[model samples]
Every structure is written in structure tokens, then in C-alpha cells.
Target: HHMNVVFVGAEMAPWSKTGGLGDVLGGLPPAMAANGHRVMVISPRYDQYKDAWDTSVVAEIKVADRYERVRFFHCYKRGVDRVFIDHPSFLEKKDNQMRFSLLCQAALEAPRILNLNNNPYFKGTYGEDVVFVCNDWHTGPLASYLKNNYQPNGIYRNAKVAFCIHNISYQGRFAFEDYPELNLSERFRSSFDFIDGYDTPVEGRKINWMKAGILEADRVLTVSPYYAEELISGIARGCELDNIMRLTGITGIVNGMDVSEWDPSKDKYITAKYDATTAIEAKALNKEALQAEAGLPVDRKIPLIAFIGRLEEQKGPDVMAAAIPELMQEDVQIVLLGTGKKKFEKLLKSMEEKYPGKVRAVVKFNAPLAHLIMAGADVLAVPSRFEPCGLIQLQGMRYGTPCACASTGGLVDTVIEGKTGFHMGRLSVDCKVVEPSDVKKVAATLKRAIKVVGTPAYEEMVRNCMNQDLSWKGPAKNWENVLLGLGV
Candidate 1:
């Protein structure tokens, strides 16, 4: 049976996006649609996107205490119809929480507003029995709204909701006093149902929206199998939602990359395009081009180490920063791209300034530069403190760049140590232990990684990376099966 699916979330690319969530939404819908499902995406229209894309007014949606006028834009790419939801109040709000809440509230009413009953996007047939897929806590309110309003008796009475938890950390917690603002009745807000009031001492007493969705949704999913298991039982329950995740039976599904976008053979950013069938000479050419761009001496013999992503603690910025000085003594050139904490940014900038020809720091997010890093670099550094399901390493694999990652989360699942990449044990997060003391350990790993770069052994590693399938076809099929089992 064909399903009409809508993804409600805070991020989607070519409109407004930040992290992996954007990448997933930007890629997954088309993959699912290719498999014969009708999928629609709904995300907030940021001010930046308003000037860039052609947007049209969709409808005025009413929430509990406010009415928001929503606008729609059609993003047609790879033959996928992506719908952007824009409301003057929601789009313009400076308060991010309230803004996202408005987006969630509006998303709950999308089926009726779009007249899914007669919309062509539904393929004109399966509109009556549509499925709503909410991504993360940002759109969690849809569950509450559906449970309260539509499930009683409506066109969407049989609509099944799937809540995808991209990250369990950001649970949208508010104080128990804020329940009235959520527009939930006292009966449903009790501890027996959706409410988990501040009984234990924790960071903040905010309402855990992600927890609410996990309890209310027909099925719940996280990005990785490891994370799914971790959510059920792990020491890293950032929001203490693991108990609820276990109680409610949360499942795991690994994310996939857009092979077309991250393809090395047709990539526009690199100087030379090569695939699994191509000779190593093409990769060499890409290396030379990247070296020239970084103002490093274009010597194919010297290894290039690359790090791309946010320069935050989450990505192990401090670990990389600590390792750089010691690693510079070796025959390796470093390329770093991304922006984050001021201290880390300053540290990288200083290093780049100090070693003009060796260290290149591009402190911003550039899509082409990211591709170039993956295409040209000998090794991709992904010492993430905790990665739910990282996309960069998968992209690196596609680009034939070997990865060196800390063994955790998706990195554990994706990077085959001693084969496609090298793995390291967990590092201490304590600054006292990390700052100047453990720097040499990180440097030694980089040197070891560089030594492994050019041999036939490294070629085998690249082949392994390229052969590994990281596309959504398999995972989407699994999700389809999971949805089919719902019997909605």
C-alpha cells in the first residue's frame, strides 16, 4: 500500500539548515519517493531563504492561542517536491523555542490546510490515509495535537505518526508552570500520560517535548542502531529520556548520504573527478589542486590531514587543537574548515598564521571547500566526542579519503578500523588532563595515520570505503517495513 508522508522539522536544505538533520531531510524524502511513497516536507521559512526562493502563501493555521499565516514554497530538486512552511510570526520570531513551537503547531494542521483530500502531491489517490513523520523535538507538538483533535473523528483519524529523534539531547524542556502555554489539558498533562514533571534533580525543569513525542507517537526512531541501544541503556542520557525511550520501545535506523551529491566522480569542487573504476592519478591531481588552494607545497608525497565540521567541543575541537602543534613537526599538511567557539577559532587562526605554508584554516562553512577537503585529503579526522550518525565520514569514504575516528556512536558502525579507517579509544573531556599533557598522543596518531596513507594497504582501505553502501535505499526499505507493520 502506498503512503502519503509529511516530514515536519526545524531544518531542510536550500531553505534553512544547520546540521545532519538538514542533510537527512534534504536527501531521505526523495529516496523514499523513489521507492513509490508520496512524501512532503514542512519546515520554517527563515528570513535568509525568503529573499532566495519563490514562496507562495499556503494558509493561515490556528494554534491554541495564536493564529499563524503560513506561506509555501516548492523546492524541486532530483524530481522531489519539497514544501516549505512559512508564517510571518513564526518566521520572524526571535525566540527560537516559540518559533519552532509555532512551526510544530502549524505542521499538525497541514493535512487539512493542504486539502490532502484533493492535493496532487498525494498522487491523487492515497490522500485520505496519510502518514505524518515528525523529526526531533522541534515538531513534537504534532503528536499532542493529533491525539487531541484529529484522532477523535476526522479525515486524519487513521493517520499514523512516526517521531524521528535526530538527537535526544535537545528535549525542549520547560518548567511545569509552562504546561498551560503548551495548551495541553490538565488530564493529559498528568504524570500518567505526557508530563514528566521535575521529580528528580536535573539541569532544568523544562517540559521534555521529545519525551512527550516518544510516548505519544505510533513508532519512535533514532539515527543509529548504536544510539538506539544507547538510548535504551547508556551512561550518556543527556536528557534522562532513556528511561522513557526504553519504556516506550524506541528503535534505531542508521542514516544514509546522498550519493549523487557526495559523489567523487562528478564532484565540481575537486580538480579531478574519479570513481572506483578510475586510476589513482585522478586522486593525485585532486591532491595537488587542494595543496595549491591551501598554499601548501603541492607534493603528493606529503600527506594532507583534513577536519571539517563545527569547531565545537562536540566535534573534539580541543583534542584537534591540542594535537596540531605536535603533528606539525611531521611531514603532513593540515586543512581545517568550520566555525564555532571563539577560543578554538582563535587557536586555529593563530596556528595558521604561525605556520603559513603548513596549516590552512578556513573559518567558515563552505560546501565546495568541504567537498575539496574530502576529495583531496589523505585522511579525514573525525575525533567526535559523541556522534549520533555522522555524515562527513561517510562522505569521506565516498571520496576515497580514509577516516581516523574515536570509537563511538555512528563512527563505530561506519568506520571499519584497520580497514577503511583507524579508530582511537575515548579521550578525557577534562581540560586539565587534555590541555597540554595528552597533546603528543593525538600527534602520534596523526603521524601513524600519515604513514599509512599511500601504500597498497591504504588503497585497499579506500576500496573498502568506496564499496561500503551508505545510501538510503536499504534503511528506507527497513523503515518502510516498520511503517507497514504499524497497520495504520
Candidate 2:
């Protein structure tokens, strides 16, 4: 049976986005629709989001001593539907805690506002037909609201709830003194507490939202299997939710990419189209175009290394900075595209100035440029501290660029060492070098990748990457099995 699914989150692409969460929501819903399910997305109407799409107010909800008027819209381009809850007062509010809380409440009530039971769009379907899949802490309130109010009232008593945690570190925590601001009942407020026995009525309340979602949701999901295991036991569990994740039996669903948007054959960023069969000559054209764009000398012999995504510690920027001096001594060119943390940005800027022709740093997120880099570069670098099923590596592979990544999380699952790309050993925080000699090891592996770029081996690797099934079909099938087991 087909399920009507609504995704509630802070970020959704072609709208508000800061990381991979946007990429997933932007792409996955369409794939879900292709599989014969009706999908809708709800997110905050940020300035960028509002400017990008036409929206109208659908409901005015009073939340926590504040009124939030939500605006709904439809994205007709991406082959899926979207609903934006625009509350300028709540969305543009300086205090994000209140903003997100109000947003969550609005998300929980969106189904009722749209009149799911009687709306012409739904064609007279009952509320039980829909499934609410809340994304991370941004929409955590939905789970609590459904369990506490809706279930008892039977408004959405038959619907199931799933919470997909993108990152555990950013659970909205406020001070206990600010508890009354949320206008939550003493019973609900008392239900949340820190593991240390501190009554953080404010920040503690936000933590409880995540905990409650983890506990109450019919299924809890993360982006990757390795991350799923990490949440259960690894150090990546930032808020100590690992125990709850373990207790509740959370699942992992690795994210997929939209081939239509990311395909090199029709890509606007590259000079020519190329698939696995014709990649040899086409890659050279892309490389030359990239060299011309970056103002670097067009040398096919020189190895091109690229980095895309946030330049944070998690992405192993420190290691990249440390390795650059040595890597520059070799016959290679480096290009980085991303923005994050002032320190890392400044460091990359310094590298750009110091290396001049050898290193080109854009320091901003550009979708076209990112695609170009993946298509043109010989190697993609992702030495992450912990990657939860990264997309860039997969994108690089799709574009026929091999990757050199750390052996952790999704990176471990995606990059096949010595075949599709190379994987380095884990690095310790105590060590001065971000990674051991693996930094040099990656450099050497990259050299090998460059040498074989136009060879038969390179063609074989490119074929492997392009042919690799990184689609939602398998993951969605797994999800279907899990949901069926839940008696949904």
C-alpha cells in the first residue's frame, strides 16, 4: 500500500539550506513519489526561501505566547510538492530557540491546517493515510504533540511518526529559567531532564524533545548504517542520546543523489558530456575548462584535487591545511569550495595567497562550481572526522573522480579502498598530525589515480562508480520492511 508522507524539517533545498540535509530532502521526496507514494515537505520560510518561491498563508497558529502564521507553497519544478510555513515574526525572530519551537508546533499542526481529510488535493483520504517523518530536532515537537494530544483525541491516532536525526549535536537547548516562555505544561516540562540530574527547564526541555522523539517514534533513522551504529555506541553521539538510540533500536538509511540534477552528461558546469563509456576524452575537456576557469595553467599531466562542503573540523580541514605544504611539493593542483568556521576560512585564504597558482580557494558554496570541480578533478578529498553517508564522495565517483577519504561512517561504506578510491586509517585528536602518515599515503594514492586517469584501469573505476547503485530504492525497500514490521 502507498503511504502519504509529510517531511518536517528546518532545511529543504531550493529553499533554506546549510548542509546535506537540504540535499536529501530536495532529492529524496521525488524518488519517494516515483515509488508511488504521496510526499509533502514543511519547512521554515527563511528570507532566501521566501524570495525563491511564491507562498501563501495557510494557517495562523498560536504558539508559546506568540502567534505564527504559516504560509504554504508548491514546488512544481522538482516533481514533488512543498508547504512552507512562513511566520515572519517567528522565522525572522532573533532568538532561534523560539523560532524553531514555533516552527515545530506549526509542523505538527500542518496536516489539520491543510484539511487532509477533506482537502481536494488529498481526494478525501482519512488522516490515517498519512505518515509524519520529522527530520531532526527542528520538528521534534510533532512526536510529543501527537503522542500527548492527537493520539488520545484520535485526530491522527492511526498515523505513524518517524524521526530522522541528521545531526545530534544541534539539539535546541535553552536555559531552565526560560521554561515558562515555551508555555508548556508542568507535566510536559517535568518529563524532560538532563542525565546529570540538573533541572534545565529551558535547555533541558529541548533535549527532552529529541529524547522523546527517539523514544516515541515508530522508527528512528539516521543517514548511514555506520552513523546508525555510531549513534548507538560511537563518539559521534554528541548529546549522549546513544543510550536511547540503542534502547529504542534506531535504523540507518543512506541518502541518495538525483542523477538528473547531478549527471555530467547534461551538466551545465562542464564543457562536454561524458558517461563511463566516453569519460577518457571528455574528462580532459572538463579539466581544461576547469583550468581556464580557475586561471591555472591547463596541464593534463598535473593532478587536480578538489574539496566540497563545509570547511569545519568534521571535514578534516586541519589535516588538509597540514598536508597542503607537502602536497604542493608534488605535481598537483588543489581547489577548495566551501565556507565555514572563520578560522578555517582564514587558513584556506592564507593557503590561497601562499600557494598562488598551486591552490585555488573559492571559500563559498556554489552548486555549479561544485559540480564542475567534481567533473573536472582527478581526485576528491574527504578526510572527515566522522562522515554520515557523505554525498560529495558519491558525486565525485559519479563524475568519474576517485576519492581519498577516512575510514569512518558513510565514507567507509561508500569508498571502496584501492578500487573506487583509497581509505586512510583513523586519526587521533591527541596527535599533532591530523592523520598519521596516511596524509602522505593519500597523496601517493592520488598520484596513482592521476597516472591512470586516461588508462583502461581508470575507465574501469569510472564504470564502477557510475554503475554503482546509490539510489533510494534499496533503502526505501528496507524502510518499507521496517514500517510493515511496525504494523503500519
Candidate 3:
């Protein structure tokens, strides 16, 4: 049952990250290793933090025109080794489609590169039977590259590929001229080329890496099962990729939390470490501390509703804002930690100014703040338009906060209706994100939550949230099944 697994992504956690994928690359690999599989992570060496990575070159790999050195870094948390394609000139940016394309090529050549170069760390070379997992649009082209070139000839002919789409909205669409960097054959370029007759978004001036990944990968999967259904059938979410997604027979695997990092019993960032048994009593101290930090009144009786992550339309910051008026009328403190969408940020800031001690809108990404909020807040408001297996809610669960989220995508899969947390926001499995109604549902949920604050029922729900299994035990097994379904 154990097989070699190579994960190709743009970033890995503890050292480099902006979100969940890094955490996945960091957490899932070791869990797989624990199941007796060999895991190797490969990503571009983004120049950011100097401390978390070991820079000594393990091996060197050449690509295109230059001979660049390659190195390997290991996660102390998981022992899963991560490889970096090191080149002095590679500048890291958000929409660097070219950079990711280069990384795809490097990862495709990684097995051969290591064997030929005679690396000091790894000994086994990739054969035809290797399993490659591509995460998001960043490493999207790796699937088509394997299917077209190596599957027909070289040593990687036995390789099986799976593409995981985190968010289809970011399709990594680059100018039509950028095809020169994909490293895919000209015959396969037709798929990369524009298409107009079909309902697909083929007439675009740019090539969508995500769309290409969905159509090209051997097996396509998303972050959650519900999200998979949304992409497969939910038309109102978007009609762009739904048809292709159905054709692909995509699977969904919900993402998991890093228990060692998020567990309330051992969390390093929080003031009081607690488990489900102690959480009810100990959470009061955390709530008071969080309230004090947010500059709100340090009252344990008041429910602290926390919103963490991007303050954008996707995450329903607008809905969160719309709910504030109704919530303020009752008695609740709001704590927000994230920055995005200028208008949303402005609106939240205005509310913070008007509400003063009632709202704390810290417009910056703080890891410590998020960890503390999980333990400290009574409810985590994730009124997202669509969430594909959100790690935030699972992280919140570890710290005993129930999530009150929209009934769509991964939200329903994670949050319970009347147990773990209540679901009142409107986005549905059909992918319809409706009007002022969606925003109003958020307000409605908060109205109920504000009334239930500090009650025995709320505490029981919080206890239920903490009792559930948020670990990767089941999801990792599903990933193994996915690998098995792909090949030996």
C-alpha cells in the first residue's frame, strides 16, 4: 500500500507560506510517511525567511538556458523533505505564471536530475510508477507535461498525476504569448491554445493554468467533497469550469488541521493550554485576554465573534459587516484579523471607529493573533461565499470555538447546524451566492448567537465542537485511496 509520493507546489509551511496549501504540504506529507510511504516535496526557493530553511545545497538542477543549483530543506515538524529549485535570478511574485512554469519543469526533471547528479540525500530515482500531486494553478502544467512528454518516452512514463484545485477563481491566466515557458509539446499546445466554440473560457487572451490543469490532470480533486460538487454541478457559482470539471470526474478530500500546532492542550501561543474537559472553564481567561488585546471591554460574559482571513467578497466580510449593526444592538464584541479589498477594509474600519470599544479591526495578518483568537473567541464567523475545505474552522475547533458559517461548500461539511455551530448564511450547494439576502442571513445568525451567548446551550455546542475529530486521520487515508486509484 505504501508508494512514493512527490508533491509539487509553490510553497511549504513553517518556512514559506501565505495560506492552506503550505500547511497541507507541511502536514499531510509526514502523515503519509507515518503510513510507510516516502514523501518528497518540491517547490521554488522563495527568498523570504532565513531561519526555517536549511540552505546547504543537496543537489543542483539545470533548466532552459542556465545551470542552477538545487537544494533540499526538511520540515522539523513533519520530517518531510522539501526540495528547492535554486536560481539567483528567480524573483518571487504573486502572479508569476512564468516562475511556476519553470518550477513545473524543474519538478518534472527532479527525479532524473537527482539520479544523474548523484544527490547526497535521496538515493532512489523516480521510475514509471511514481505518483505526483500538483497543488493549485501554480504547478498546474505538471500534469499535462507528464501526460504529453514523459509518459510517451523518458523514465517518467510510468508516473501518475493528480491535480488539486484549491480555488478555481485564481486560474493563473497569463498572456497568450507565455506558452513558450510551459515546456509542453506543440501537439499538446492545442489544449493550451484558445477555444471558443465550447462553453469553456477558451477565447481568453490568456491561458488559464487551472482550467488546463482540470482538463489535463489524470485525476482532479479539490479541497473538499462539497466543493467538488459545487465545481461539478453548481452553476450559479460560475459556469466557466463546471462542464470540464464534470468531464474530469473530480474527487474531493477535505483538508485537515496540524494538530501539533493547533491543539489547545499544547498550543504555544495561547495563554492557557486546554482540552475539551478544561476548555469550558479555561476559555474564560482567554476571552478576557483577547478582549483586552482588541481594546474591547474585558468581559467574559460577552460573546467574542472572530473573523480571521482575507476581508474580501469570497470570505463575506461584507456579510460580517452587515451583521454588525444587528449584533451591536444586542451585546457582542467583534475582532477581525485580515486585510483585503479596499472597500471592505474601509467599511470595517468605519465600523471600528464608530463602535470604538465594540469592534477591533486589526488590518494585518498575524499568526499569533489567529492562534490566540481560536482559543479566545466563542464563535468563529466564516460567512464565506464559497470555501474549499477551510483550515481556519478546523483550527478554531481545536481551540473550542464553534464556527457560524454560510451553508455552502466546506462550511456545511465542517460546521454542524445546531451542535458544533449554527449555519445561517445563504450560499448553498447549488453554488448560488444571492444578493442582500446572503448578507442578511449573516445578520440573522449573529442575532441568534448574540442571544445565546454564555448560555449552557452555547457552552454545550462549544464542547461538541472541541470533541469532534478535526485531525487528518481520515483525509490522509482518502488521499492514499486517490493515489491507489491513479496507479500502483
Candidate 4:
């Protein structure tokens, strides 16, 4: 029998997005629905998408002492019902932790509200069989609250919770004074509370939202199996989460992309759409197009190396910077598209000034430009120190662009050392152990990519990358098993 599933996260694609979380929120649930299970998604409604959604006040929930009202829009798409939590002041606030905490309480009350509001316009088939899938630290406290109330509260007596840590470094954290806003019960306060409250290393007063969720969740998972291993090793389990991870098992399920959206044969954003068979020529054509658009020389022959993603240390901007001057030593051009860390931005600017037409850095999050880069580039530098199942390398492969990345997390699992791309050093699971600024390694990989261009080896590598399955089928089935095991 199939179980009812509700995914709770901070962002949802095509509506609210800041990073990969939205993509997963947008893609995975629908795949779950298609996998013979009923699915619903809950996310915060930001001001940007307010006009795009029309919602009705289905319930009013209490946070702290105030009765915070909730309005949910039935945004059913691809067999999944998407519910947007509308709390105007908080959702659009500069400090959005309170807004996310608002989501946690509302998510716990979702079943009650849905049953009360279930109609032709709204669907809520929630029951004991429903599973609440919490994403990242944003909804981490849901586990703590459920642990506190599940047995005594008949409404949640048999419900199960699954927590996903997309990235641990950005765990939602705040001082003890801020905890009151979460509306958590006094039962969780102490030292002796239901929530395992601990002072952070940086500040004694700060509390970890992720750790609290970890202690309360029945089952916890990170984005990749490798990441799960990394978490238990106690290296990058930020906020001292090693013992808790050892006490509670965390599984790794590699995330999958929505093939329909990422398929090169069907993408409307690129100049030319091509499948594996035609990718060799089509990619070259896209390279010329990308070059022309970026105000660089329209030469498809100069091997193009592209680095695309949020420009941060996690994505390895330092390694990218260290390797750039050397990588540019080749008769190649580098295309970079992303915005982050002003220092890294300045570094790119200095390179552009020195290299002239050989370097193109558009330090902005431009979607169409990103798509073009994926299609056009010969090799994508995904030199991430640690990746919890990044979409960039997968998307690059989908567009017939191989990747040169760090041998850590999902990157090692996705890209083969020589067949698809080059990965540096011995594969280490810990993000802390992985060096982002390994100048020689990243530079050598860049040179290897340029050296292999037009050879039969390159053709086979492109075909291999394009042939691999990057769809949601396998991952969704794995999730289905995890949910069913818990629901029963």
C-alpha cells in the first residue's frame, strides 16, 4: 500500500528559490506522486511569488503566544498538491528564522488544518499513514515538537518523521532568547528537555536547530550516501553532532534531477537542443553562441572551461582562484557565472583585466546564462570541497559536459576519475578534509580537459556522461521504501 507524503522545506522551485533545495522540493515530491504514492509539498510563500499564487486562510496556528494565521494555496502540479504558508510579516523578513520556525509549527498543524479545510479546492488526505519529510534545519524543530507530542496527542499518535540535512554548515542557529519565538514547549528546555539543547562552540547561549531535530527524528538522512558517512565520522558534523549521529542512524540517498526539466533534447533555453547522438556538434555550436553572447571571441575551437554555481568556499571558489591563472596558461577560455563572496568577485575582476577576451565572468545569478554554460562548455569545473548531491555536475552531464571536481561527497560517486571527469586526491567523505584550494590538482584537471578535446576519448566520455541515468526514478523508489518502512 502507498503512503501519503508531505514534504516541508524553505523553498520550492518555479515559485521560491535560492539554491538546490528549491529544485529538490520542486522535483522530488512530484516524482514520489508518480511512484504510486500521494504527495503534498509545504513551503514558505515569499513576496516575489505572492502574485503568482492565490490562497485562502485555512487555519490559524499559535507561535510563542500569538495566534499566527495560515493561508494555504492549493498549487497542485504534476499530481502533487503544493501548499504555501502565508504569514506576511515574517516570511518576507530580513531575519527569516522566525519565518521558518513559523513553518515548523504550521507543518505540525497541517494535517488538522487540511482535514478541516479539505474540499474540491483543497486536498488533504492526511491520516496516520502520512509522512512528514522535513528538509534542512529550516524545519528541523518539527522532529523535536513531534517527539514531545506524538504519543499523548492522538492527532500525531502514529505519524512518522524523516529529517533531511541538505547542508549542515548552514544549520539554523540562534541564541536562547530566540528560542521562545519557536513556541517550543518548556519540556525541551534544559539540559533535561525533550530537545537536546546545547550551547554552540562560538557562543554559549546559541542553540542548534539541527541537533534538536537530530535527537528527535526517528530517521535522519543527508543528500548523499557518502555525505551520510561523512556526518557519522564527526568531521564536518558542525555543532558537535557526532555522538548523536552515531546514536541515530543517518542514511544517504543520492538526489536525482527532474529529467523532463533538465533534458538537453527538450530545453528551450539553449541555442540548440541535442541528445547524446548529436551532442558533439551541438555543444560546439552552443560554445560559439555562448562566446558571442559573453562578448568573447566566437571561437568554438578554444577549449571552454566553465565554473558555475554559488561562488562560495563550499563550491570551492578558492581552489578555482588558485587554479585560474594556471588554467588560463592554456590556449583556452574560462566562463564563470555566479555571485558570492566579494573577495572572490574581485579576484575574477582582476583576472578579466589581465586575461582580456580569454576570461568571461558574469558575477550574477542568471538562469538562462547558466543553461547556456552547461550546454556550451567542454568541461564544467565542479571543484566543490564537499557536495551533498549537487545538481550542477548532473546537469552538466545531462548537457554532455563532463566535470572536473573534488573527490568528495556526491561528486566522487557521480563522476568517474577518467571516463567522465577528473577528481582530485583520494576520495574523502569529510568536507573538512577536502581541500578547496588545491591549486595543482584543479589546474591539472583543467589542463587534462583541454588536452582531451576532439579526441576519440573525449567522444566516449561525453557519450558515457550523457548515457548515465540522472532521473528521479531510482532515488524516489529508495525514498518510497524508507517512508513505507516508517509508515507501517
Best by TM-score: 4
Model 1: per-residue lDDT, tens digit, 1-488?
67767788888865667888998888788788787767778787776454335444366555446765666655645535466666565444324556766677666655454533223344433354667788988887777767775667765777788889887657776666666666666645753133443465553445667767777788888888877766676534442343443444677788988787788878888888888656266778888888988888899888999999787766777778778878878878999998998988988888888887889988887888788788889999887666788888999998888898876677877888788898765554442235443465566667888998888888888888888788988878877877786676
lDDT of 4 by residue, 1-488 (tens): 66778899988887877778888898888888887666788887775454345555466666666776877765657777788787775343334666776788777666555642332433454655568899988888887776665656566677788888888766565666766666667776542122233454443556667767666777888888887776677545332333333534788889998788788899988999999999999999888999999889898788999999777667776567667788777898988888988978887777777787898888986889999999999999887766778899999998889998878788867888777887865323343333444777788878988899878899889999999888887888888888877854
What TM-score would each prediction reach against the true structure? Answer: 0.87, 0.87, 0.89, 0.90
Where does candidate 4 stray beyond 4 Å? 48-57, 90-95, 115-124, 190-202, 237-247, 426-437
Rank list by TM-score: 4, 3, 1, 2
RMSD of each: 3.7, 3.9, 3.8, 3.5
lDDT of each: 0.73, 0.70, 0.74, 0.76
Mark the 10 consecutive residues where model 4 has the least summed lDDT.
Answer: 191-200
**Candidate 4 backbone collisions, by pair:** none
Return the candidate ranking by lDDT, descending.
4, 3, 1, 2
Show the lowest summed lDDT stretch of 10 residues, model 3: 113-122
Overall local distance difference test of candidate 1: 0.73
Q: Residue by residue across 355-455, what tens digits does model 2's lDDT show?
A: 88888888765777887788888888887766777888988888888888877778877889767887776544322235557566556655665666667
Q: Following a full C-alpha superposition, what root-mean-square deviation does model 1 have from the true structure?
A: 3.7
lDDT of 3 by residue, 155-183 (tens): 67666788898776566766777776555
**Which pairs of residues have clashing backbones in candidate 3?**
60-70, 128-158
The residue pairs in collision within model 1 are 173-206, 173-207, 174-206, 174-207
Q: Candidate 3, TM-score vs. the true structure?
A: 0.89
Measured with C-alpha atoms, the lDDT of residue 421 in candidate 2 is 83
